[PDB]
Amino acid sequence: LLSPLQTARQLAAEFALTAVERDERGGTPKAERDALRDSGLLALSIPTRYGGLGARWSETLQVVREFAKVDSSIAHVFGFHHLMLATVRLFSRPEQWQPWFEQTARQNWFWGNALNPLDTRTVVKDLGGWREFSGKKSFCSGASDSQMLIASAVDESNGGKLLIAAIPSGRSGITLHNDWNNIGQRQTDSGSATFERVRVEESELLLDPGPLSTPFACLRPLIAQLTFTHMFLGIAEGAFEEARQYTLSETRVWHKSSVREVREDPYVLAHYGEFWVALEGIRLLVERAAALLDEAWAKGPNLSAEERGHLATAIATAKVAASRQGLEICSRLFEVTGARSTHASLRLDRHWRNLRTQTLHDPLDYKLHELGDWALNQSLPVPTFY
Amino acid sequence: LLSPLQTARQLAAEFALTAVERDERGGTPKAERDALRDSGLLALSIPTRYGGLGARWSETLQVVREFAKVDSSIAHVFGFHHLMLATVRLFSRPEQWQPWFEQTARQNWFWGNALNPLDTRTVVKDLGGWREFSGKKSFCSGASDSQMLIASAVDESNGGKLLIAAIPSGRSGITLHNDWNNIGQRQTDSGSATFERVRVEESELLLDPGPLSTPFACLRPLIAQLTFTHMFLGIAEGAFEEARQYTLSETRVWHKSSVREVREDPYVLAHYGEFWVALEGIRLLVERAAALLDEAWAKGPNLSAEERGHLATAIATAKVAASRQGLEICSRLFEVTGARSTHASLRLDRHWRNLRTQTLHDPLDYKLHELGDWALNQSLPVPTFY
Amino acid sequence: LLSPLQTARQLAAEFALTAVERDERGGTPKAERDALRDSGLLALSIPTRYGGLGARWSETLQVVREFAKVDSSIAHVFGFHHLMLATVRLFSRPEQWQPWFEQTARQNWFWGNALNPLDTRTVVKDLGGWREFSGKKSFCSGASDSQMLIASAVDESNGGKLLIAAIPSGRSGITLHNDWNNIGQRQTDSGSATFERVRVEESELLLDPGPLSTPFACLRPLIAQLTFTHMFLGIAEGAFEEARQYTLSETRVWHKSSVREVREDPYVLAHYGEFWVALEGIRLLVERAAALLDEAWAKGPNLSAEERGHLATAIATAKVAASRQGLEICSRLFEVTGARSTHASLRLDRHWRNLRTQTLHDPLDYKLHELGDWALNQSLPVPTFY
Amino acid sequence: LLSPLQTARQLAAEFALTAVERDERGGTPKAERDALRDSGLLALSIPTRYGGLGARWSETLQVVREFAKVDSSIAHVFGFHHLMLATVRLFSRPEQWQPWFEQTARQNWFWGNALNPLDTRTVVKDLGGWREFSGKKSFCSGASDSQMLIASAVDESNGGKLLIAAIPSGRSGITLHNDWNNIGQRQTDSGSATFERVRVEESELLLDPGPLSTPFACLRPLIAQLTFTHMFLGIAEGAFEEARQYTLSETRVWHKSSVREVREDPYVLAHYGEFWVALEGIRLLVERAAALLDEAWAKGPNLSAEERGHLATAIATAKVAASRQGLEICSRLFEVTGARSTHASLRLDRHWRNLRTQTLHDPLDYKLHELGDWALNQSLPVPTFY
């Protein structure tokens, strides 16, 4: 009866009831992941001809942003789920990803991450008709309580070429350790995994056209980067709104203030003006990047390298603004909520913690280096794994 | 044969040949204003039915922004000219502004500013069938070398209510001092004037609906504020482009640098990345406000107070970002141009000086206060004179 | 055999072995407080003629700063203990504070805080030869596991004047709730308490000269403010040292870096240069304020209001720099420690959490307001309760 | 009748009467340089046994700071004059610098700069008993209206080794072009020069111990760096004080302000609090560097490399804070002086211009790299020319 956005807004209102408790507990949010299974949003990005909803990427990422306002962990695993589907859609043949799309929309499969282009501990051995992955991996976001995984391994014999495959999460030889113990993103299950002679069929390798091939295939790392960017904006929007309610309800004026109510304090209003200017700038940069992704995705295999590069620059521009100005909002909001807002039962610092931990996996200094290379030299970004 | 934007860019190229020498000289850019007269751009905002070009406000403000990249003083007087035309359009009867629009488009009249809501020195005396303005005025931007002026006066008999009129710039009793001597905006002719029993006919009064009346009439201060905003963006864009060319042509690497060329220095590239993130955020905010102005203007006298309020918030949001981040670009650009870019023949500081002097008339602390009142209390800004 | 600074450093080393686990646990650090009892440092500020160690305030605050580098909660309760001793020294007669100094140095009494000038719930009733406190109090830092408390109450019969007393922490009618549950300062025991007809003798009242009386007595709020300031500097120094060791031991260079080791990465070195500039500025400001406190304290009751005012300005100046630049260090350090430094077993965010929660009780916007009133108008700050 | 500091304060009060006019004119401040000749301050740094005043370096640099508050150009040439005397004192034999010291104190010689370790256009040829310098030089601060110059040349035959000499400014073959045309430091005469077969005696070469030899000799670039640092603080202190007088005298409240007078506006006072916190931090860092220079200078040829390095780090720390926070003060002060403070007759932007132009010859990014190398790796700075 409701559109995807309304369905996501209804789920997020329910997630918000337990978001503070679940930040303290951590672990796997089994009940929340089951609600995502039952809502049908796991097929949001799948076209209608496969039983999906057929949303544009801007709409899919809008839901990730909506979840990140109340629960950035749920947003992370949800956004990564659609990133895994985008991975098989871009790296494999239609004979592969079409059945995967159909089965996902029908059985509500949850896709987790086991792909790390820097963790080289997992290697692949060829046994003729099948492959075997062996080694350890780190940062396996969404691996727990998932049906499918995107797993990677290095060749060693082929100069260390990276190999990507789509395998069931419960396949023999895969061990999810569930050792994720972080200060933020505490319910993304980004722990480690162990692969011991994990059989991989040739029909499960994502080779045509494979990673980092056509500019269309090179949308994969950009989708990953723009997924985090929508999460960052959502975190800041959620921290801003929760700070707004605390200021208006349970915040007393400083005893030296000239205003009787905190709604009219000049310094408080100045802080809120700063938050607004920052958020409005981030919103437009993120949404423009989302619109450019929609138009680039529509090009399909005809996508040009120049258009891919202009999209990469727009995404990184939004990601820098979302990272820096978003983190400043999550810290400065305490100056308008008051000394009583630091009570442990509120966990108001969770927004800063979640944003602080995720903005580190992609150092801002090297993104500014790339944006400056474009601004000064008109150099397009080089396609690499995210 | 050429669109107004192409005509503006062609003028801006010629203006740039003398912009540095004219910044030192100050005074009235008479040759540059005569080029605007012969270009037809003085009728840009006038609808085609009155002999004008019929551009939307976003297109007119884009030309203001394009002139500001090379000559912010010309952009200032050009934007204020169209602001004066919007003043009679919004405040007076069609029997008044229609002939004014017709004669302006036909004779290329240059409209100047003699309106100062915060200067109480000019008073109006009612003689019966006509009135007379008497007093002193300051900040009369574009008054010199103009054909018409928007002049204001206070009625000390009616509690000090402000009265606005449109009178010929050379009417008996009007004396222009040409004492404009400022560190920035040095060719805006913003000196002082003296009114000695200047006759004002009743037909020249802007009374129906008059200033600060309907939401449509309350677009006048927003157009003024958005005109400065496009100028602020243009100044920053011009300083960026000029710094870019200097970095690529004359700047030498520091002797202790790691790169052999300044194009690859990581600190230089990081600075340009910061400039790009800042500029892209300003550009989207400014263009978004321009689009809402187009949509608001199209409503005409059916414009609601709520839609006017959302436009005011969008304009102020873009003005804060353009003012703060723009001035930071005009200062930090010297860190990538080098110690030899401060030669007085280049006047590279003129962008900073122009932006620094103009951001003072609208103090940012009170704009942040207004934006915070909306962000926290959802209070729409009260329409006032700009 | 060891100086007090050497004894403090030796304790700080042992405290650091469990500081991370105790930050998660919260509650009362009973073992750490017993170590302070056996170390003799509870008599650090007491003159040698009363059995104490006779340190100057700069030396006592240096120990607070040294404890804050590894355990800001212990530094908080340790600094407040000496603040309570300064309270009776400045507010009461020598016939009162001399025996208190003697017994404290001889029995290693731990003095806690029950003073809250902004909590009007505790009232005093005059029964004739004695009085009784009744009401509820919050933010009772160091009240648990303490021998003496500085308690306050309001006299609703005399216009609400605040009355301060020094009473045993275990006197009949005093109930400690131990409900302190905060994101930071998690072992300061700053929970709430309830006073049920708690008898207070006239000899226990701090009336001569009493609070906010002479300039010498007005040093009490400045000592409190400077105690937090040394804690803020210590937190930032501790976070810096811990980030330094992590950078040199566990941090790995970004895969797109230009250096083979993280020690030579230009962005990493630039961050550490910013931390050094920030820390050196804070250190000098804090130590300069400590020196003026020593000189002010030496004047005794001959202290002038002007010298007290210049000290207040120097302390607030150092507190602003320590608060703002300190918190920035605690956040930006993650950009040089890396994505693997956010593991929950390290609790590297504890420095930010501790500093973020404590800077809220003294809002910086009003400290800047006070400092501007001196910088512009040369107006000395009015002595008030801290 | 007056001490050096009082004499400098009396000169600076007279310089301030014409500082605004002379910023516009530029050129050589002949009258002001003659006042320095007549005051005896040109012998401030010369010991008493040579007819000088015998000031410590902290006192000499204090005068440079005092001049920079009213006239940064005069401060620059005055500070460089004593830097030239320090050059012969550190690089040459007492048989050379002692007569130079005596003649300077007796005849009030003004020493100018012609030393540029990066401008390699001036070469030296050996003719047996004498040398000849030939080439062009840039940035010859204080060369005009001077009696002695420190001139440098490259050997070419000895692998390009730099050679430094002290020669009379009016020697045959030297041509001072007086083409200094800059946006700031407009009266330092930092134009170019031409050397055509300029004879240099062997007794005029500064070779024992020569440049960059002993750690004591390596104080020369540190004195140069600390001279600029005192100038930067003086510029910011002077801009702050001139802004203070304008705010209190001729600054109107914003018409939307709640305060009746500008002395009590909350945003204005906040800005002044920010200025105070910044200035106080810079003052302590600069003065601590000045004290360390005094103690290092007293070591003489016994100065250790470690003590020289710790001084270099302290100086650079003060220089970064003085450069960045000083420039921010010179820009932000316009937000408290108002829109009427940008009048060209005030030249209030001259403080920002002077500081902006000088902070570029020593890029802050590479100083932070050096301070970070110490903060992280305990690496002392490498002695190089300034």
Query: Mapped to the 3 state alphabet, what secondary structure does chain A carry?
Result: CCCHHHHHHHHHHHHHHHHHHHHHHCCCCHHHHHHHHHHCHHHCCCCHHHCCCCCCHHHHHHHHHHHHCCCHHHHHHHHHHHHHHHHHHHHCCHHHHHHHHHHHHHHCCCEEEECCCCCCCCEEEECCCEEEEEEEECCCCCCCCCCEEEEEEECCCCCCCEEEEEEECCCCCEEECCCCCECCCCCCCCCCEEEEEEEEEHHHECCCCCCCCCCCCCHHHHHHHHHHHHHHHHHHHHHHHHHHHHHHHCCCCCCCCCCCCHHHCHHHHHHHHHHHHHHHHHHHHHHHHHHHHHHHHHHHHHCCHHHHHHHHHHHHHHHHHHHHHHHHHHHHCHHHHCHHHHECCCCCCHHHHHHHHHCCCCCHHHHHHHHHHHHHHCCCCCCCCC
Nearest to A36 by CA among A70, A62, A74, A3: A74
Nearest to C186 by CA among C23, C76, C69, C32: C23
8 Å CB contact between B88 and B201: no
Treating both helix axes as pointing N-terminal to C-terminal, what angle do B219-249 and A364-377 enclose, rounded to 10 degrees?
80
As given in the structure block, the two tokens for residue A46 are 């799948």
Residue of A nearest to C358 (CA): A339
Q: Note whether D331 contacts B327, CB cutoff 8 Å.
A: yes
8 Å CB contact between D347 and D183: no
Q: Note whether A366 contacts C256, CB cutoff 8 Å.
A: yes
Residue with tokens 């282009």: A117
Alpha helix ranges (H) inside chain B: 4-16, 19-25, 30-39, 57-68, 72-91, 94-107, 219-249, 266-299, 305-332, 334-337, 350-358, 364-377
Query: How far is Cα C341 from Cα C326, in angstroms, rounded to an integer?
Result: 19
Treating both helix axes as pointing N-terminal to C-terminal, what angle do A219-249 and A57-68 enclose, rounded to 10 degrees?
40
Query: How far is Cα D49 from Cα D40, in angstroms, rounded to an integer?
Result: 15
Half-sphere exposure of D109 (CA within 13 A, CB side): 25
8 Å CB contact between B355 and B326: yes
- Residue A371 is nearest to which of B248, B273, B284, comparing CB atoms? B273
For A13, residues 6+ apart whose C-beta sits below 8 A from its C-beta are A70
Q: What is the enclosing helix (H) or strand (E) of D111?
A: strand D111-114
Q: Note whether B276 contacts A374, CB cutoff 8 Å.
A: yes
Question: What's the start-to-end Cα distance of chain D, in Å?
Answer: 37
8 Å CB contact between D238 and D351: yes
Q: How was this structure determined?
A: X-ray
**DSSP code, position C157:** T
Which amino acid type is present at position B297?
A: W
Q: For residue C209, say if its preceding peptide bond is cis, omega within 30 degrees of 0.
A: yes
Q: For residue C47, say if its preceding peptide bond is cis, omega within 30 degrees of 0.
A: no
> Which residues of chain A approach chain D closer than 8 Å at the C-beta?
258, 266-267, 270
8 Å CB contact between B30 and B37: no
For B298, residues 6+ apart whose C-beta sits below 8 A from its C-beta are none
Which amino acid type is present at position D206?
A: L
Size of interface B-C (CB pairs under 8 A): 8
User: Gap positions in chain C, given as the residue before each gap (C–N > 2.5 A)?
Assistant: none
Give the residues across from A124 on adjacent strands.
A133
Three-state SS at D87: helix
Query: How far is Cα A174 from Cα A186, in angstroms, rounded to an integer?
Result: 22
Residue A128 burial (10 A CB sphere; 0-12, 13-18, 19+): exposed
Query: How far is Cα A218 from Cα A206, in angstroms, rounded to an integer?
Result: 14
Three-state SS at D361: coil
Diameter of chain D measured on Cα atoms:
80
* Angle CA C141–C143–C144, to nearest 5: 120
Query: How far is Cα B315 from Cα A280, in angstroms, rounded to an integer?
Result: 11
Q: For residue A209, say if its preceding peptide bond is cis, omega within 30 degrees of 0.
A: yes
Question: Distance of CA D282 to CAs B20, D79, D279, Å?
Answer: 36, 19, 5
Q: Which of A24, A178, A182, A183 would you mutate first to test chain C, the one with the most C CBs within 10 A?
A: A183
Query: How far is Cα D220 from Cα D242, in angstroms, rounded to an integer?
Result: 33
Residue of C nearest to D265 (CA): C369
Query: How far is Cα B108 from Cα B327, in angstroms, rounded to an integer?
Result: 34
Residue of B nearest to C269 (CA): B267
Phi-psi region of B20 (alpha: psi -120 to 50; beta: other; left: phi over 0): alpha
Q: Note whether C363 contacts A182, CB cutoff 8 Å.
A: no
As given in the structure block, the two tokens for residue D255 are 């018409």
Question: At C383, phi and psi to the nearest 5?
Answer: -65, 125
**DSSP code, position D113:** E
Half-sphere exposure of A317 (CA within 13 A, CB side): 33
Query: How far is Cα B340 from Cα D142, in angstroms, rounded to an integer?
Result: 18
Count how many residues are written for chain A.
386
Strand pairing category for A174-176 and C161-168: unpaired
Strand pairing category for C111-114 and C130-137: unpaired
As given in the structure block, the two tokens for residue D209 are 């111990």
Q: What is the enclosing helix (H) or strand (E) of D99?
A: helix D94-107
Nearest to A171 by CA among A150, A135, A200: A200
Min Cα distance A263 → chain B (Å) is 7
Query: How far is Cα B92 from Cα B96, in angstroms, rounded to an integer?
Result: 6
Q: Name the percent of chain C in helix, strand, coil, to the closest 5.
A: 55, 10, 30
Residue of D nearest to C368 (CA): D273
Min Cα distance D266 → chain A (Å) is 8
For C273, residues 6+ apart whose C-beta sits below 8 A from its C-beta are D320, D367, D368, D369, D370, D371, D372, D373, D375
The gap from C-alpha B213 to its chain's centroid, in whole angstroms, comes to 23
Q: Chains touching chain C at 3 or more Cβ pairs under 8 angstroms?
A: A, B, D
8 Å CB contact between D136 and D193: yes
Judging contacts by C-beta atoms under 8 Å, the chain D residues touching residue A266 are: 258, 266-267
For B360, residues 6+ apart whose C-beta sits below 8 A from its C-beta are D334, D335, D338, D339, D341, D342
Task: Convert A212-248 to b/e letters by CB count within 10 Å (16 or more is b).
Answer: bebbbbbbbbbbbbbbbbbbbbbbbbbbbebbbebbe
The gap from C-alpha C205 to its chain's centroid, in whole angstroms, comes to 24
Query: How far is Cα B98 from Cα B110, in angstroms, rounded to an integer?
Result: 16
Rg, chain D, Cα only:
22
As given in the structure block, the two tokens for residue D345 are 């007759």
Query: How far is Cα C212 from Cα A220, in angstroms, rounded to an integer?
Result: 67
Residue B300 burial (10 A CB sphere; 0-12, 13-18, 19+): exposed
Q: Chains touching chain D at 3 or more Cβ pairs under 8 angstroms?
A: A, B, C
Give the residues across from A162 on adjacent strands.
A154
Residue of A nearest to D264 (CA): A258
For D6, residues 6+ apart whose C-beta sits below 8 A from its C-beta are none
Q: Chains touching chain A at 3 or more Cβ pairs under 8 angstroms?
A: B, C, D
Diameter of chain B measured on Cα atoms:
80
Give the residues across from C343 on adjacent strands.
A182
Min Cα distance D267 → chain A (Å) is 8
8 Å CB contact between D331 and B331: yes
Task: Convert B60-86 to b/e letters by CB count within 10 Å (16 or more is b).
Answer: bbbbbbbbbbbbbbbbbbbbbbbbbbb
Residue with tokens 């500008």: D262
8 Å CB contact between D23 and B344: no
Judging contacts by C-beta atoms under 8 Å, the chain A residues touching residue D267 are: 266, 270
Torsion of CA C276, C279, C284, C286, to 10 degrees: -170
Residue D85 burial (10 A CB sphere; 0-12, 13-18, 19+): buried
Question: Distance of CA B357 to CAs A333, B25, B77, D241, Å?
Answer: 32, 17, 15, 20
Give the residues across from B163 on adjacent strands.
B153
Which amino acid type is present at position B22?
A: R
Three-state SS at B135: strand
> Which residues of chain C approach chain B closer than 8 Å at the C-beta?
258, 266-267, 270
For A215, residues 6+ apart whose C-beta sits below 8 A from its C-beta are A303, A304, A305, A307, A308, A383
Treating both helix axes as pointing N-terminal to C-terminal, what angle do C266-299 and B266-299 enclose, rounded to 10 degrees?
90
Count how many residues are written for chain C.
386
Three-state SS at D150: strand
Which amino acid type is present at position B192?
A: S
- Residue D363 is nearest to which of B254, B342, B366, comparing CB atoms? B254
Q: Got the DSSP string for C88-108?
A: HHHHS-HHHHHHHHHHHHHHT
Q: Which of A265, A277, A370 would you mutate first to test chain B, the one with the most B CBs within 10 A?
A: A277
As given in the structure block, the two tokens for residue A14 are 């329910």
- Residue C118 is nearest to which of A255, A327, A361, comparing CB atoms? A255
Torsion of CA C352, C354, C359, C361, to 10 degrees: 150
Nearest to C362 by CA among C287, C299, C312, C304: C312
Judging contacts by C-beta atoms under 8 Å, the chain C residues touching residue A363 are: 254, 267, 335
Q: Note whether C183 contacts A349, CB cutoff 8 Å.
A: yes
Query: How far is Cα C276 from Cα D24, in angstroms, rounded to an integer?
Result: 39
As given in the structure block, the two tokens for residue A92 are 């494999």
Query: How far is Cα C81 from Cα C356, in angstroms, rounded to an integer?
Result: 22
For C222, residues 6+ apart whose C-beta sits below 8 A from its C-beta are C293, C308, C311, C312, C315, C386
Among positive and negative, which fits the CA dihedral A81, A85, A87, A90? negative
Rg, chain A, Cα only:
22
Q: Note whether D365 contacts B118, CB cutoff 8 Å.
A: no
8 Å CB contact between D204 and D167: yes
Residue of A nearest to D259 (CA): A258
Q: Chains touching chain B at 3 or more Cβ pairs under 8 angstroms?
A: A, C, D
8 Å CB contact between A194 and A140: no
8 Å CB contact between B311 and B292: yes
Q: What is the enclosing helix (H) or strand (E) of C290?
A: helix C266-299
As given in the structure block, the two tokens for residue B261 are 């060329």
For C11, residues 6+ apart whose C-beta sits below 8 A from its C-beta are C35, C36, C39, C41, C67
